[PDB]
Design an enzyme around this catalytic site. Structure first.
Site, PDB file in Angstrom:
ATOM      1  N   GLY A 149      44.219  45.275  39.966  1.00 36.49           N
ATOM      2  CA  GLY A 149      43.999  46.660  39.522  1.00 36.49           C
ATOM      3  C   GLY A 149      44.550  47.002  38.155  1.00 36.49           C
ATOM      4  N   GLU A 184      38.559  47.807  44.465  1.00 30.43           N
ATOM      5  CA  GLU A 184      38.798  46.408  44.812  1.00 30.43           C
ATOM      6  C   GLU A 184      39.491  46.220  46.158  1.00 30.43           C
ATOM      7  OE1 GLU A 184      40.676  44.489  41.404  1.00 30.43           O
ATOM      8  OE2 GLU A 184      38.680  44.125  40.579  1.00 30.43           O
ATOM      9  N   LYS A 237      47.530  33.003  35.651  1.00 30.84           N
ATOM     10  CA  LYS A 237      47.738  34.019  36.666  1.00 30.84           C
ATOM     11  C   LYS A 237      48.823  33.691  37.698  1.00 30.84           C
ATOM     12  CE  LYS A 237      44.486  36.241  34.478  1.00 30.84           C
ATOM     13  NZ  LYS A 237      43.507  37.020  35.357  1.00 30.84           N
TER      14      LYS A 237
END
Ligand SMILES: O=C(CO)[C@H](O)[C@H](O)COP(=O)(O)O
Ligand SMILES: O=C(CO)[C@H](O)[C@H](O)COP(=O)(O)O
Lengths: 217, 217
Positions: free
Chosen positions: B94, B102, B120
């Site tokens: 988000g 989502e 990530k």
């Protein structure tokens, strides 16, 4: 009850309104009468925060300064009614009022003064349907999840909240562990607010009665 | 890091798409390569449910039918990027996408396929700021509660969500119990959605590496 037990109740709350304070005000016939008593001491009140459109406009008329939540770090008190309240002073709220606004103002206030007639006290929460405010794209999702938890959700059609969310009123639950079920519903994606006030409940419960108003502190 | 890697993860996800299925599709650069992949299969799937305005446009130009969440009772997969992801496959999401959107598509989907580059994966969630969607009237209150949880909330000024809510991006947290923290934030009155995907994390992690896509299941 009658408008007079509600009124006995509403006026008995005036005793927690201290001088120079900003008063949390909720909504309802019982809080109506509380606003009537509050006007009698408008001069020693800084003002009010309300979670209700009707109350705000009434406080205004009476010349009470209105505050918004973001202007305050706390409220001393929030005065408000309940749909249901149990013996542990946990409540169902938001059936007939701005659920999300109520739960926020209640969170910010130190003391919750619940003002009610003889019809709100129950041993087990749930006969009164539990409201849940829901992101509309999530409505069917949340309903499925509420079913799994032993509710029967009914979409309140033809209306939205000021934010544009929808409301499911959940019937048939026997809410023996309100704090759990609050957690469970709060953890469903698409849930905005649930009308279980279990983690944060009533602090002082004032009940309207034939003669007068019983206060449980 | 490189788009080559992002591209590799994106195409690697094609493998999870069933002929005749309605595909959960997310947002972002990595996701766009997946949408590229879905295209090579347009005439063979039923449609897509999208968590993204930009992704919706892209699916439409491939002639892929758009379904809304209220129109399905489930989704087989939801393929999406993440802002951060830990070894337990819990995610911060988000950050630059439709948070609430989502989390809802992700809840409705059976398997969440997380496609990322090398950048990530983290040891402890929380360096990247955790997005929390908040009811405007609750902003200061919710900020005060997140501070109590060890965070430094920063109000994302100038913008609101679709819903008309605001965003608090919360820096400085050491999120070593993501399930717990998502519970704690989810229970703050005024929170709508928190960007911790912890109770429902990723089922499959596809990472684009210097040496092709790599799949953790
Ligand atoms: O709906 C609930 C809150 O939304 C309340 O029960 C109601 O708004 C106030 O109580 P009453 O009208 O009985 O005095
Ligand atoms: O779904 C969004 C949430 O912020 C992002 O786009 C996703 O987290 C990141 O993938 P990428 O690095 O290619 O944008």
């Amino acid at each position: 009850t009658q408008d007079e037990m509600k009124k006995a109740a509403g006026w008995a709350a005036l005793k927690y309104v201290e001088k120079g304070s900003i008063v949390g005000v909720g909504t309802g016939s019982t809080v109506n009468h509380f606003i009537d008593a509050l006007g009698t001491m408008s001069e020693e009140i800084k003002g009010a925060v309300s979670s209700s459109v009707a109350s705000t406009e009434k406080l205004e008329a009476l010349g009470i300064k209105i505050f918004d939540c973001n202007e305050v770090a706390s409220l001393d008190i929030y005065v408000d009614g309940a749909d249901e309240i149990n013996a542990d002073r946990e409540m169902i709220k938001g059936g007939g009022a701005a659920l999300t606004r109520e739960k926020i103002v209640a969170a910010i206030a130190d003391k919750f003064i619940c003002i009610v007639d003889g019809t709100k006290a129950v041993d087990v929460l749930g006969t009164f349907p539990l409201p849940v405010e829901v992101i509309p794209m999530a409505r069917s999702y949340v309903a499925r999840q509420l079913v799994k938890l032993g509710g029967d959700p009914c979409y309140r059609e033809g209306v939205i909240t000021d934010n544009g969310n929808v409301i499911l009123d959940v019937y048939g639950m026997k809410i023996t562990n309100p704090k759990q079920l609050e957690d469970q519903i709060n953890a469903i994606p698409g849930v905005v607010t649930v009308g279980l006030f279990a983690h944060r409940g009533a602090d002082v419960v004032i009940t309207g009665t034939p003669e007068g108003a019983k206060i449980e502190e």
